[PDB]
Design a protein around this ligand. Structure first.
Ligand SMILES: Nc1ncnc2c1ncn2[C@@H]1O[C@H](CSCC[C@H](N)C(=O)O)[C@@H](O)[C@H]1O
Ligand SMILES: Nc1ncnc2c1ncn2[C@@H]1O[C@H](CSCC[C@H](N)C(=O)O)[C@@H](O)[C@H]1O
Lengths: 256, 263
């Protein structure tokens, strides 16, 4: 059960690995993983999906090695590999277009007449949250959701007003500033907030707190990247929708 | 060779599973695994044969949605039926379009499941607003364009008042991604313009993202309402507002039916 497009040559697929749990891979991803000659991957939350790679052909780490590689180089590696006839698979955490420089990579690709495909992935801000029992939207609660990165140019007031649920990528180092920005924008100090670290991995960990207390709580809990930060009433649903908790003993409750 | 340390879909439980936007390749391993195990697959109209072909033979396929003309089952009816299937000992798959938790009443369903003591799992899927737009060459995020994205429903934005604070939504993110915004595009688009958005800001409509029927219209906020009508376009569509729409000319990879090539 796979009659789907082949990973060709002079070509690169920018492929979403999801937040960690393999099997949150798309069938397109699994297939690409099966046929790539070379895989240029990130900081992977699960190094598990790489077990799918075809009879050992080159793995290529592209994250921090110790210094860094600037995107420019990573992108230009893809083209180098592609022009030399490899089936190239650029393997990205989560979804390639949700804060993952994927648009940059693809722009470079066309800029050098390299054909590409994009394979969407599960992003930590939606699927990861799901593994914590927190939906990004729920009828009674929100008709909008904003997804943002911590480093701004970011209209903090417009987000504060306007966005009943807020979902934050790379906001650990700045959590103190950000929550203070929301509170001053008219958000309640007591508004529920949740941190989810290593969403959808066996190392998953959750902090339930509050806009006013968030900075003290995550210092105290000793929490660390990678983490999605979510703000808003939907946090209250975790007590009721934590299906992972339910697998061990958890007694799931009713909404408010 | 394998995919076989994956969790079984157990007798008497319900999985809420995202089918993604259309393309069967966008199913997750977990979803494909559910499909192959299910005794009964309760699915959306916003579904798509190809997925369903993975069901074992003698699985039953139940259309949860609206048949005839408009005489709807309310959400509660669909949820109770899931409970009835599960209590009878079926392995139950509720197959939802896209992702179960993105404007798809998955929370409500799960909540109903909990109330009636039925265990469940959630299986994320690709959402039309991220993966769908990818198939049209529009990234939802791009560091030269935006550090924030807002997703919304236009569902109840007829113009009986409702509380989206359209001005906050206008200032909050350079990119806006809108679900169920076709029928009320005129009012929504005027909300955004009253909110400070430029009448000329680029807008794209993506209908049936990630299917052989995909169709895209670029336009602007002022012209959006007239244009979409003249183009004859229909739900399901995602409407994206902002500069990322300009990247489709350079990133339209599905436009590998033909060169004409990327800026
Ligand atoms: N498993 C995980 N759990 C929690 N947050 C995660 C995560 N994986 C990635 N992230 C978030 O994503 C940031 C990396 S930026 C890459 C985002 C990725 N393309 C995606 O769609 O998910 C991290 O700082 C963290 O905030
Ligand atoms: N294939 C597709 N192409 C374009 N828009 C789609 C789509 N599938 C779903 N949608 C959008 O989704 C709305 C239904 S509500 C379902 C949303 C789903 N949970 C998801 O994550 O995508 C539609 O009215 C339309 O705005």
């Amino acid at each position: 059960f796979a009659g789907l497009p082949a990973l060709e040559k002079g070509s690169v697929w920018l492929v979403g690995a999801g937040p960690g749990d393999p099997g949150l891979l798309t069938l397109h991803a699994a297939n690409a993983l099966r046929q790539a000659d070379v895989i240029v991957h990130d900081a992977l939350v699960n190094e598990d999906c790489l077990k799918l790679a075809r009879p050992g052909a080159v793995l290529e780490f592209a994250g921090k090695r110790g210094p860094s590689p600037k995107q420019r180089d990573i992108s230009l590696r893809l083209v180098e590999l592609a022009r030399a006839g490899n089936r190239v698979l650029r393997l990205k955490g989560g979804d390639p277009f949700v804060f993952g420089r994927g648009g940059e990579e693809a722009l470079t690709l066309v800029e050098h007449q390299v054909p590409f495909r994009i394979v969407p992935g599960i992003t930590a801000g939606i699927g990861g949250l799901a593994y914590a029992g927190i939906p990004v939207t729920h009828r009674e609660v929100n008709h909008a959701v904003t997804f943002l990165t911590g480093h701004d140019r970011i209209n903090w007031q417009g987000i504060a007003s306007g966005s009943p649920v807020i979902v934050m990528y790379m906001a650990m180092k700045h959590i103190g500033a950000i929550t203070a920005n929301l509170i001053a924008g008219g958000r309640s100090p007591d508004e529920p907030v949740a941190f989810v670290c290593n969403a959808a991995t066996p190392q998953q960990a959750v902090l339930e707190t509050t806009l006013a207390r968030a900075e003290a709580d995550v210092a105290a809990a000793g929490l660390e990247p990678p983490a999605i930060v979510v703000v808003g009433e939907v946090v209250r649903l975790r007590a009721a929708l934590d299906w992972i908790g339910a697998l061990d003993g958890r007694k799931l409750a009713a909404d408010p």
